[PDB]
Structure formats: C-alpha cells, structure tokens
Amino acid sequence: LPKSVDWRKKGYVTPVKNQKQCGSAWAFSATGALEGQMFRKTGKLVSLSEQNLVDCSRPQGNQGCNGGFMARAFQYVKENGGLDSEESYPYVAVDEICKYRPENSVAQDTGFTVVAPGKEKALMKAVATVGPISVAMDAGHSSFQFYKSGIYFEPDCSSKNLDHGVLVVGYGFEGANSQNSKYWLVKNSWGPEWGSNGYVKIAKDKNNHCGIATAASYPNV
Ligand SMILES: [Cl-]
Ligand SMILES: [Cl-]
Numbered sequence: 001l002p003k004s005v006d007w008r009k010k011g012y013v014t015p016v017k018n019q020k021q022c023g024s025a026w027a028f029s030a031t032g033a034l035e036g037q038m039f040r041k042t043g044k045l046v047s048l049s050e051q052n053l054v055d056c057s058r059p060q061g062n063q064g065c066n067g068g069f070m071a072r073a074f075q076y077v078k079e080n081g082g083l084d085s086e087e088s089y090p091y092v093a094v095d096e097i098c099k100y101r102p103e104n105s106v107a108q109d110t111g112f113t114v115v116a117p118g119k120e121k122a123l124m125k126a127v128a129t130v131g132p133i134s135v136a137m138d139a140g141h142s143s144f145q146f147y148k149s150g151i152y153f154e155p156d157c158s159s160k161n162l163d164h165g166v167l168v169v170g171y172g173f174e175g176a177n178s179q180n181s182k183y184w185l186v187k188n189s190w191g192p193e194w195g196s197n198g199y200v201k202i203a204k205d206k207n208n209h210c211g212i213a214t215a216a217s218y219p220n221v
Pocket of ligand 2: 197
C-alpha cells in the first residue's frame with residue numbers, strides 16, 4: 001500500500017460542512033463517502049444532501065437530529081433509488097418533512113461494504129484502494145472540541161463506545177520515516193473553523209485509537 005494517501009488532492013472531497021446543533025454527523029459522514037464514490041464513478045464532484053438523509057431515513061433506523069449510522073444511510077439510498085443534491089435539498093439542521101425528489105437525485109448506491117472491524121490495516125487498504133471511508137469515532141472529549149494541530153491522541157478515548165461519524169480521506173506520517181508518527185486524515189462536520197480547516201490528524205497504528213477502524217464502511221456505486 002502507499003506510504004500516504006490524501007483524496008483531497010485528487011478532487012474527491014467537498015469543502016468542510018457544518019452540522020450545527022443537530023446530531024447528524026452520521027449523515028455528513030455518509031454524504032462524504034458517497035461524494036467520493038460518485039466522483040470516482042463519473043469525474044464530477046457534487047455536494048450531496050445531508051437534510052435528505054435526516055428527513056427521510058427513519059425507516060432504515062436513523063433518528064434525524066438525534067443520531068444515526070452511516071450504514072443505515074447507505075441502506076436508505078439503496079432502497080430509495082437515489083439521493084438529492086445539497087443544492088436541491090439544503091441543510092437546516094432540524095428534523096423536517098421528507099421532501100425527496102427523484103428528479104434531483106445525483107447519487108445512487110447498491111448497498112455498502114464493511115471494513116473488517118477493528119483492523120487498522122484493513123482500513124488502510126480500503127482508504128488506499130477505494131476513496132474516502134465513513135468511520136465512527138469517540139469524539140466525546142474537550143480535547144477533541146478544542147483540537148487545532150498535531151496528531152490527536154486522547155487517553156480517555158474508547159475504541160468501542162463511539163459517538164460520532166466522520167470521514168477518513170487519507171493517511172500519512174510526519175517526518176521522513178513512513179513507518180512511525182502515523183496518522184489518519186479525518187474530515188469533520190463542525191465547520192472549517194473547527195480543528196485544522198475542519199480536519200484532524202488522528203494517531204494511526206496506536207491500537208485503533210478512538211475506534212477509527214471499529215465501524216468503517218463505504219457505499220457501493
Ligand atoms: Cl455505520
Ligand atoms: Cl488544510
């Protein structure tokens with residue numbers, strides 16, 4: 001596998017969005033993964049609707065602004081036959097009436113693939129071969145809230161009890177040795193002002209830190 005990967009440098013990733021006061025990170029992680037897979041398929045980067053997921057995927061088990069899971073979102077897109085664009089179905093950060101319109105759909109998936117649970121090397125392989133990957137993580141720490149630079153490492157992090165969905169857009173390392181001071185490149189949904197332009201470097205090959213490889217998946221387009 002490559003020593004480092006960053007799909008942002010290849011055009012697969014939209015600018016950082018902001019879920020605001022709605023527990024919809026699962027939806028942003030899902031649209032993020034879908035955006036990259038659709039780009040791989042068509043060469044066009046089109047921002048996708050998190051509000052369409054929030055409003056319409058309760059049947060698949062999501063709970064709108066009160067939480068959800070990326071796999072259930074990819075399941076909804078499959079069963080639904082489509083997903084609208086961000087422009088056509090804008091984000092308002094509150095649970096609303098499902099207004100899915102097929103004519104505005106710009107994405108589809110046939111289901112999703114799960115990364116072997118808990119294996120950072122499996123996640124490394126998925127990231128290098130597929131594109132950005134949706135992952136769950138333990139983000140319940142002030143250290144994460146006020147993260148700004150460096151490789152994030154939090155001793156109180158859990159690899160099993162997760163509360164936030166994010167997007168792995170690559171991986172890398174500091175220095176000249178590709179085999180140490182490694183990190184996962186993670187896109188968050190708390191706006192570009194949070195973290196490092198909306199991103200965070202999370203310690204990689206440090207025992208599945210914060211659960212990054214516990215529940216990773218990607219849509220099949
Ligand atoms: Cl999930
Ligand atoms: Cl940057």
